[PDB]
Amino acid sequence: SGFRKMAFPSGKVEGCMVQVTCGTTTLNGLWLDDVVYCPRHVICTSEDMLNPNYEDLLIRKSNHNFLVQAGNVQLRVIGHSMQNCVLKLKVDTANPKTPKYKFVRIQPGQTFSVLACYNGSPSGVYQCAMRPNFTIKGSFLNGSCGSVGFNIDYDCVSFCYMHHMELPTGVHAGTDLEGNFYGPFVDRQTAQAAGTDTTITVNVLAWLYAAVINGDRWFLNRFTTTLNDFNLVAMKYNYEPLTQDHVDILGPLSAQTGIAVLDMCASLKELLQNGMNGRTILGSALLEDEFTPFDVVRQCSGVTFQ
Amino acid sequence: SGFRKMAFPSGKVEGCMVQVTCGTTTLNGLWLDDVVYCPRHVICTSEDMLNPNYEDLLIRKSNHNFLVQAGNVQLRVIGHSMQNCVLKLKVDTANPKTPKYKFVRIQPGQTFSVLACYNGSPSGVYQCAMRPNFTIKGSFLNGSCGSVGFNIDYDCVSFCYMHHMELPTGVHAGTDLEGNFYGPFVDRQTAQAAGTDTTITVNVLAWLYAAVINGDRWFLNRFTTTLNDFNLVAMKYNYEPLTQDHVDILGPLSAQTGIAVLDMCASLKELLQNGMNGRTILGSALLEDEFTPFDVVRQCSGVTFQ
Numbered sequence: 001s002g003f004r005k006m007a008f009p010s011g012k013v014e015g016c017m018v019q020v021t022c023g024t025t026t027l028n029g030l031w032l033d034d035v036v037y038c039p040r041h042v043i044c045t046s047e048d049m050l051n052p053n054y055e056d057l058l059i060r061k062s063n064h065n066f067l068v069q070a071g072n073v074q075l076r077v078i079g080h081s082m083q084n085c086v087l088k089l090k091v092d093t094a095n096p097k098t099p100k101y102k103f104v105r106i107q108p109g110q111t112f113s114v115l116a117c118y119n120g121s122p123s124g125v126y127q128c129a130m131r132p133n134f135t136i137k138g139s140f141l142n143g144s145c146g147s148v149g150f151n152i153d154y155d156c157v158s159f160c161y162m163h164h165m166e167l168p169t170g171v172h173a174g175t176d177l178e179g180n181f182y183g184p185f186v187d188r189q190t191a192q193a194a195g196t197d198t199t200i201t202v203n204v205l206a207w208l209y210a211a212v213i214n215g216d217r218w219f220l221n222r223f224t225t226t227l228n229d230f231n232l233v234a235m236k237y238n239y240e241p242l243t244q245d246h247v248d249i250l251g252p253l254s255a256q257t258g259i260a261v262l263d264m265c266a267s268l269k270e271l272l273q274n275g276m277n278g279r280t281i282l283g284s285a286l287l288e289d290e291f292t293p294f295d296v297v298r299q300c301s302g303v304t305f306q
Numbered sequence: 307s308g309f310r311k312m313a314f315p316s317g318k319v320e321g322c323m324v325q326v327t328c329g330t331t332t333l334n335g336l337w338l339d340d341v342v343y344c345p346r347h348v349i350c351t352s353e354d355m356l357n358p359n360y361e362d363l364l365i366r367k368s369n370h371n372f373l374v375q376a377g378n379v380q381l382r383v384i385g386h387s388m389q390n391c392v393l394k395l396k397v398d399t400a401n402p403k404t405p406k407y408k409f410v411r412i413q414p415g416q417t418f419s420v421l422a423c424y425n426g427s428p429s430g431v432y433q434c435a436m437r438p439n440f441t442i443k444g445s446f447l448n449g450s451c452g453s454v455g456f457n458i459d460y461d462c463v464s465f466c467y468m469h470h471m472e473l474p475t476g477v478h479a480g481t482d483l484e485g486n487f488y489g490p491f492v493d494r495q496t497a498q499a500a501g502t503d504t505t506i507t508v509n510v511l512a513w514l515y516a517a518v519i520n521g522d523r524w525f526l527n528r529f530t531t532t533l534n535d536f537n538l539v540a541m542k543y544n545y546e547p548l549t550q551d552h553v554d555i556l557g558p559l560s561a562q563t564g565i566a567v568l569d570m571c572a573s574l575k576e577l578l579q580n581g582m583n584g585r586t587i588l589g590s591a592l593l594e595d596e597f598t599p600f601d602v603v604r605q606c607s608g609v610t611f612q
């Protein structure tokens with residue numbers, strides 16, 4: 001028993017992290033086979049970053065301008081190209097530690113692990129969710145760009161995020177590994193802002209089921225509700241709508257606990273309308289929305305990875 | 307910016323995890339050089355575990371009774387011995403992935419990363435603190451025994467915890483890597499209970515400094531207090547006493563924020579006496595006590611590991 005915000009083991013990704021330096025700028029790259037991926041703003045300098053034209057900036061660059069550090073071994077760059085907001089640096093050595101991998105793009109509401117890195121060296125690992133407004137609430141300092149987010153499925157790493165920037169409210173924005181930004185953000189230094197966020201309703205319900213599985217039951221009740229009547233309550237409290245597909249996804253957790261999904265919705269309603277009255281749920285005094293139904297089943301059942 | 311519960315990269319420990327099976331029991335082992343460490347209750351069966359005599363049970367065992375799985379490679383056991391509550395299985399192959407390491411015992415209030423494992427395969431990684439009552443609030447299921455806790459300092463892994471058991475309140479107990487239990491627990495199936503816990507005061511203050519560094523300032527005030535007057539408030543709210551050494555350890559964080567330690571104590575007092583009034587601090591509606599001053603400095607400054 002117990003419930004923690006759990007990341008995937010990071011070993012498979014650690015073996016892919018490299019340092020990329022161009023001019024004044026040092027950031028992280030992801031080395032898979034004979035390509036290093038990194039944010040294209042590495043080719044920028046502090047006055048380039050106000051409003052750059054990256055095609056113009058990149059044609060002015062040479063292979064030898066890119067210094068790639070694989071620990072204490074330098075990688076020879078033999079080609080470079082730009083793919084949307086990422087650079088692909090072709091090197092003359094394939095990474096012998098390349099895991100099986102996929103480039104996937106995730107949906108708002110889904111979770112992933114982040115391996116935060118500085119100078120190509122991993123610093124720590126933590127779990128994030130993609131917010132509905134396409135930001136992530138991360139922990140990133142100067143030099144963390146190019147750190148990646150990922151999930152692991154048995155032995156395959158699905159890379160879903162590469163870090164590019166911090167917005168003025170302290171939240172973070174970045175791209176998938178094809179270089180396409182999540183959300184309406186651009187890799188320029190102009191006034192950008194996150195935009196209004198909402199709470200991920202289906203994840204809150206999943207976490208309430210995790211609490212029941214772990215013996216926290218005080219928030220349960222005999223009442224029930226309809227999906228439509230629940231969603232009127234969700235709208236007022238800035239929760240996003242619950243769909244029938246969400247109800248279906250919660251089915252396993254419903255069946256394991258014997259608590260009908262719509263019954264747990266009735267409990268959430270009372271929690272939204274009444275607060276928590278000085279009590280806690282799974283060690284939290286807030287309704288937590290960064291665990292997916294998959295996360296709960298994985299943790300409350302013991303799935304591993306090889 | 308941002309503040310997350312961050313674990314250490316787990317790659318160095320993943321390469322040490324093996325599966326140990328004896329009779330009916332399968333658990334995890336830690337393979338360093340030519341020794342595999344694991345909980346000694348692997349030699350038990352379900353009626354042995356009520357009240358066993360481990361010396362009697364172990365003399366009845368043979369090397370060939372211990373089946374050690376290093377992924378899809380079997381390790382030949384060539385000797386076995388017991389050290390307190392851990393077994394040391396000598397194998398004929400040194401682990402080529404052995405990191406530089408140390409066996410250290412931690413203090414209540416300190417933090418570490420846990421690599422949860424099943425059948426020798428890592429499942430996830432998360433950060434824990436050793437509670438004042440010597441339990442940890444983990445996430446562990448059947449088969450997780452032998453998963454280890456650790457810190458990394460540059461390139462050296464300091465192993466501090468090996469998992470043995472779950473207590474009736476859902477918290478967890480285990481040993482250091484010398485096999486000595488943290489706290490007054492024993493590896494038998496008899497009525498044991500955690501005992502009363504307290505909040506780790508110095509860690510709460512560290513986390514309040516992390517919040518200031520990240521722009522959460524609403525809980526600050528112009529008042530101050532003396533160390534003695536603070537500790538009278540801490541006693542009532544079941545916080546442990548703050549010492550002058552704690553004040554000294556908080557010095558760096560005090561100097562970076564310009565908020566005197568005793569001033570932050572005055573803020574904590576008002577938070578304890580008034581609650582939080584519907585607001586949050588670093589995304590939490592509770593006072594968080596599982597970040598050490600070191601954890602805050604590491605995260606709010608960007609230290610890496612090679």
Ligand SMILES: *[C@H](O)[C@H](C[C@@H]1CCNC1=O)NC(=O)[C@@H]1[C@@H]2[C@H](CN1C(=O)COC1CCCCC1)C2(C)C
Nearest residue numbers: 041140142143144145164165166167188189190192
């Ligand atoms: C890359 O290491 C760095 C990571 C930032 C620094 C602080 N926290 C982080 O996550 N990214 C940048 O420096 C980017 C680069 C320059 C400006 N950056 C910012 O993060 C500044 O934040 C603003 C957000 C919207 C308005 C413009 C940028 C770009 C975006 C090229």
Ligand SMILES: *[C@H](O)[C@H](C[C@@H]1CCNC1=O)NC(=O)[C@@H]1[C@@H]2[C@H](CN1C(=O)COC1CCCCC1)C2(C)C
Nearest residue numbers: 347446448449450451470471472473494495496498
């Ligand atoms: C080892 O994989 C297992 C891990 C437990 C199972 C559930 N969650 C966990 O962390 N440990 C045990 O099964 C130990 C073994 C047998 C009983 N165990 C318990 O955890 C049962 O909990 C009780 C706690 C105090 C009273 C006796 C045990 C021992 C302790 C040998």
